[PDB]
Amino acid sequence: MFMINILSLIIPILLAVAFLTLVERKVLGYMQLRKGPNVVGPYGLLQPIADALKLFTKEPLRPATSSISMFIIAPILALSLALTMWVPLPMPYPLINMNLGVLFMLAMSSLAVYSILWSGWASNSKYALIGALRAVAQTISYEVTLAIILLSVLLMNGSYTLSTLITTQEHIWMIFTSWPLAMMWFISTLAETNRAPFDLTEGESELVSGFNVEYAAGPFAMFFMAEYANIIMMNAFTAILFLGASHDPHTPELYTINFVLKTLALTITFLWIRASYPRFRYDQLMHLLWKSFLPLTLALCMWHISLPIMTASIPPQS
Amino acid sequence: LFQAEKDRRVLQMLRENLEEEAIIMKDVPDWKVGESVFHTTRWVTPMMGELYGLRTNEEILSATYGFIWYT
Amino acid sequence: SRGEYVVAKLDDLVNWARRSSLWPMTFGLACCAVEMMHMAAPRYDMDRFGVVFRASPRQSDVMIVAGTLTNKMAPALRKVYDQMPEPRYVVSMGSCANGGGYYHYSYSVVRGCDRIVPVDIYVPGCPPTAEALLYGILQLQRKIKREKRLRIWYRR
Amino acid sequence: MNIMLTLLTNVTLASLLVLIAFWLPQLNAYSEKTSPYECGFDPMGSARLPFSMKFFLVAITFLLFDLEIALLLPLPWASQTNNLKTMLTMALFLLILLAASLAYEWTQKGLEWAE
Amino acid sequence: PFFDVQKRLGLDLDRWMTIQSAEQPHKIPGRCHAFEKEWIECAHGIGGIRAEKECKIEFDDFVECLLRQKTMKRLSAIKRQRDKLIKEGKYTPPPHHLGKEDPRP
Amino acid sequence: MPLVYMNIIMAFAIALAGLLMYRSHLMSSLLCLEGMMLSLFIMSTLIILNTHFTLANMMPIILLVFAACEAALGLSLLVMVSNTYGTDYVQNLNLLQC
Amino acid sequence: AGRIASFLKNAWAKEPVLVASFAIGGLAIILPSLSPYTNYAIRINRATPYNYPVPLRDDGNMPDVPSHPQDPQGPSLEWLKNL
Amino acid sequence: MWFEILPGIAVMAACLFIPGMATAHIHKFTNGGKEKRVAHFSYQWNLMERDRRISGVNRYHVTKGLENID
Amino acid sequence: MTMYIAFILSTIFVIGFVGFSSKPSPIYGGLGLIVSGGVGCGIVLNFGGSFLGLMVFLIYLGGMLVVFGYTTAMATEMYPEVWVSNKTVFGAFVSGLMMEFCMVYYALKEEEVEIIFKFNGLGDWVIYDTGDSGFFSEEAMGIAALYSYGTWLVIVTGWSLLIGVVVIMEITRGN
C-alpha cells in the first residue's frame, strides 16, 4: 500500500512540472503582450505532451570527449533528488514523518548541487566547465545564509519537525513575525534553484546553454523536469514555513487546498520575477549574499535567539 | 503501570529463556544452567540479545529497528 | 490489417508531437534576422505555435538560415548543422540564403545555403515579411505531418 | 525501511527513464556529430586544462562558516535548558565571533576577487 | 607536564565529561552507570598501582558491561548447540519461541 | 567487538595507508586526511551511541569542526605550492634535499 | 557626541544595512539583561516535568513535602496559569 | 485574454491536489480511518507496541474500549 | 544475520574508502568520499544518531564542493586517471577489495583475532539497550548540552575558528 503512496506522490509532480512549464510560458507571453502556446490543443493544454514525446523520440548524444559514466549518472541523480525532496513535507500529513525533516531538506539541497557540477565536468566542454564553476560559486554564496535564516526562523518553532510548523502558525502566519528573514529566504530560494535573476549556471546570454550545453533529448528533459520540480518543492517549503494554513484534523482537504493555492501563488511570483528583472553577475551575487545578507542575517539570528528568552516565549518540544 | 508491566514482561521472557536453555544445554557436561557472567550479584539490565536471542527474526527486527524505521 | 493500423496511429502521434514542438536555433546572420525577431514580436507570437528559440544546437529541431552565407561562415554553419540531433530541418530565409540574392556574383558569398546543408523550405523575399516566414513555418509543420516513418518501416 | 524503498523507487524510475531515452529513438552518431562543442569552430585547447579560480579564499572561508553552522544548529534544543543565561551568553559569544571573523576578512580585502 | 590549574582554582574546565556517571542532562543514566560508579568508588584514593590488582573484579564487570564479550560467547554457544540439535531433530522449540505466543501489556 | 567496528577500523587503516602513499597530487593526500576524519567521526559516534554517554555527544561535532581547520590549512598551503610551480606535485617539493 | 552624529549620518546615507545589523545585534545583546520576563522563561523551562518525580521515603520530618498531589504543599503554577 | 492562463494553472492545481489528499486517505485506510499515529519519541513507540500487543490481532489501530475490563 | 543492512552499509563504507584511497584523481576521490559519507550517515542513522549523521553528511557535502572547485582550479591534468586507466590505481583498488574480502571471510568463518582481539559478529542488533524511557532524544539533549555544560569547549572552538580565518588569510597573503 505504501508503494501506491509513492507512485501517487511521484506521478502528479511530474504532471505538474509538465504543466508548470506551459503556465510559465503562457504567463511570460501575457506579461510580454503576447499569447503563449495556444494552437497545440485547446489553450495549449497538449503542449507538455508534445514536448515530452518530441524530446523522448529524439536521439540522445554521447560526446566523444565526455566521460560517459558521470554524464549518465548526473541527470539520474538530479531527478531522483528532486523527487525525493517531496516526502518530508507535510500536506497536511507527510509521506515520511521525520523527526529532523528540515535537516533532511538541507542535506538533499546540498546533494542536488553536486549533480549540476558533475554534468558540467563530464561534458569535457569549456562552457560546461564555466557553468559548473558558476554553480560552485553560487552554492558558496547562498549555503550559509540559507542555513542561518532557516535556523533563526525555526527558533520560534522549537524543533526541526515540519509538521510542527502547522501548529506554530495556528493563529498567525510567520511572515508577520520574521518578514526580513522571509524576504531573505525568498532571495535565497531564488538563488538556490538557479532562477532569474540568478540563472548564472545556465547563462543563456553568456554561456549558450551552460552546463547542459552538451545534453540533449531525454537527459536534457530529465534535467529540465528536475529543475522545475525543485522550483515547486522550494516554493512549497516556503509556503509551509512562512504562511501557515489552518489544518482541520477532520478535514485535511481544506489544508491541502490552501497549501496548493499558496504554492501556486509563490510559483507565479517566481515567474513574475523572472519576467521583470535582468541577470546578476555571480561575483555581484556573492557580494550581495556576503556583504549585505550575511551581517543582517547574523543580527537577525542573535535577535531571534534573544527574543524568546527575554519575552518568555520559548516553544515546547525540547 | 507501564513500569510494572515492563518488569513482568522482561522477567517472564528471561524465565522462558532460562527454562529453554536448561532444556537444550543439559547434554553439555560442564555447563552450569543460568550462570551469570558478572561477579556481582546485583540485577543487571538485559541486553536485548538475552531476551530475543531464541526468538524469530521478525520480532528481533521489530525490537531493534522497529522504532527507528517507523517514519 | 492490425499492425499497419497501429503503426499508422503511431505515425500520427509522433508526427503531431514533432510538428507541435519546433525549436529553432537562435541563429541569424543578416537583415532577415530582424524580421525573424519580428516573428517573435507580440503581433505574430511564434511561441503560440509551440515555436521557441533555443541557443544550444543540441536542444534545437530547426535551423533558419536568415542572412547571407559567406565563405568565412560556411564551415561554422555546417558545424552547427551537424551537431543538431536528428530529426533536423533547415529553413532558408531570404534571397541571400536562398541563392545569393543581391550578392550572387560576390567572391565571398556562398550561392545558396543548399550548397552546404539540405534545405526543406525556401522562404522568398528580401527580406520576407514575418507573415511569410510564419507561413513557411506552418508549411514545414504540414510537411512534417505528411511524413510516414513507421509505416515505411513496417513495409520493409 | 520506507525511506529506503522511496530512494530505490526514485533511482529506478530515473534509471529506466535514461534507458528508454537511449534505447527508443534511432541512433546515428558520427565523428562530426559527436565532436566537442564550441560556437562555430574547433576548440584550441582542452577543457581539462587548469581553470583559475578567483574566489579560493572565499571558498575556504565558506568551509569555516559551514562548520560554524554545525555549531549553531542545535540551538532550538539548547534554548530549553534550565540555566538560560549561560546558554544565551554562549550563543551570543559564538555569533559575535562569527561576525568578528567576517569583519576581519572584509576589512583586509579578503572578500575582493583576485585580479 | 601536568599543571593542575583546575584543582588549584576549583574551575571544572573539562571534568564534567570525563566519566559516564557525572551529571548527565535530565538525569539520563549511562549504560553501565552502576559498574562505573562501583569501580570509581572502590578504586578511589589507593593509587593506580594498587587499584590495578585490588580492583580487578569491579573493572572486569565494567569492561564486560561495556563490551559484552562473555555474554556474546555464551549466547553464541547456546545458539550453536540449539542449531545442532534441531539439525539432528530432537528439540522442537516451543510455540512462544516461534511468534505464536500470547502477548501481554 | 561487532562487525561494524571492524569495518570502520579497516576503513581508517585504508585511509591511513592511502595518505602514507603519495602518487602525484597533494589533493589526494588531503582527501585521505578527510577520509580518516570521517572514519574517526563514525567510530566515535557509534561508541557514544552504543554506551549511552549523553554528555559525550557534543564531542564528535567538535571533532568535525577541527577537521575543517586541517582541511582549510591544507587548501591554503596547496594554493601556495601551485602558485610557485603551477602544479600540486609533491615531486616539486624537494628543494630542502640540500 | 557631535562627530558621532556626522559619522552615523554618513553610515546611514552610505551603508544602511550595516547600521541596521549593528543596531539589531546591540539590542539583542543588551535587552535580555534589562527584561523582567527572562526569569519567567527560566522558571517555565524549570517547571516542565520531563522526568518522573521519584517519591521520598517518609520519616515524619517533612512538613513542606506533600503526601498527595492535590495537597496544599509543594510548588504551584498559578503564576504560569495567569502568565 | 489573460484568463486563458487559468486552465493550465487549474490543471497544475489539480495535480498538486492529488498527493496530499491521497496520502491522507491512505493514512486512514490502513489505520482504521483515524489519523495514523505519530511516534517521534520512544514513549509513543512503546505505547504503539503495547496497543498492538493488547489488540490480539497484531494491529495497533484495533483499539480496546472499557468493555475489555469486564 | 538480520537482513545484513548494517553489514551491507559498512561494507559499502569500506568500499568507498578503498575507492578514494587509491587516489584516482581528486574528482573521483571526492565522488568516493561523498558516497562513503552518505553511507556513514546511514550507518549512524541505524543506531539512532540522526542529527550527527545528517550533520556529517551536510558538512562533508559542503566541504566536498569546495574541493571540486579547487581540483578544477589547480589539481587537474590533461587526462584524469580513473580506477581502470592505470596499473597502479587498479592494483591498489583490487588489493584493497581483496583485503576487505579476506578480513570479512576471516571474521565470519572463525572468531580469531586480526589486529585488536577476537570477536563474535552475529549481527550488531544484539548490543542494543532495551531502553524504554524518555519523551525526548538522548542525542538531542547531549548535543544541546554544548551550551550549558560545554562553555570551555565553545570558547576554545570559537577561538580556533577565528584564528583559522586569520591563519588562512595570512597563508594566502602571498608576496
Ligand SMILES: CCCCCCCCCCCCCCCCC[C@@H](O)O[C@H](CO[C@H](O)CCCCCCCCCCCCCCC)COP(=O)(O)OCC[N+](C)(C)C
Ligand atoms: C503510455 C505512454 C506513451 C504514449 C503517451 C501518450 C500521451 C497521451 C496522448 C496525447 C493526446 C494528443 C494526440 C491528439 C492531438 C491532435 C489534435 C488535432 O488537432 O490534431 C489534428 C490531427 O490529429 C492528429 O493527427 C492525431 C494524433 C494522434 C492520433 C492517435 C493517437 C495515438 C495514441 C496511442 C498511445 C499508445 C502508446 C503506448 C506506448 C507503450 C490536426 O491538428 P493540427 O492541424 O496539426 O494543429 C492545429 C492547427 N490548426 C489551428 C490549423 C487547426
Ligand SMILES: CCCCCCCCCCCCCCCCC[C@@H](O)O[C@H](CO[C@H](O)CCCCCCCCCCCCCCC)COP(=O)(O)OCC[N+](C)(C)C
Ligand atoms: C583566572 C585568570 C584567567 C586568565 C586567562 C584568561 C584566558 C581564558 C578565557 C577566560 C577564562 C575561561 C573560564 C570559563 C570556564 C567556564 C565555566 C565557568 O565559567 O562557569 C560557567 C559560567 O558561564 C559563563 O558564561 C562563563 C563564560 C563568560 C566569558 C565569555 C567568554 C570570554 C573568554 C575570553 C577568551 C575568548 C576568545 C574571544 C574573546 C572576545 C558556567 O557556569 P554555570 O552555567 O552556572 O554552571 C554550569 C554547570 N551546570 C550545568 C551543572 C549548571
Ligand SMILES: CCCCCCCC/C=C\CCCCCCCC(=O)O[C@H](COC(=O)CCCCCCC/C=C/CCCCCCCC)COP(=O)(O)OCCN
Ligand atoms: C555590538 C554588536 C555587534 C554584533 C552585531 C553585528 C552582527 C553582524 C554585523 C557585523 C558583520 C561585519 C561588519 C562589517 C564591517 C565592514 C567594515 C568595512 O570596511 O566596510 C566598508 C563599508 O563600511 C564602512 O564604511 C565602514 C563602517 C560603516 C558603518 C558601520 C557601522 C557603524 C555604526 C553604525 C551602528 C551604530 C550603533 C547602532 C545604532 C544604530 C542607529 C540608531 C568598506 O566598504 P566595501 O564594501 O569594502 O566597498 C565597496 C564599495 N566601494
Ligand code: SF4
Ligand atoms: S535577403 Fe535581403 S534582407 Fe535578407 S539578408 Fe540578404 S540582403 Fe539582407
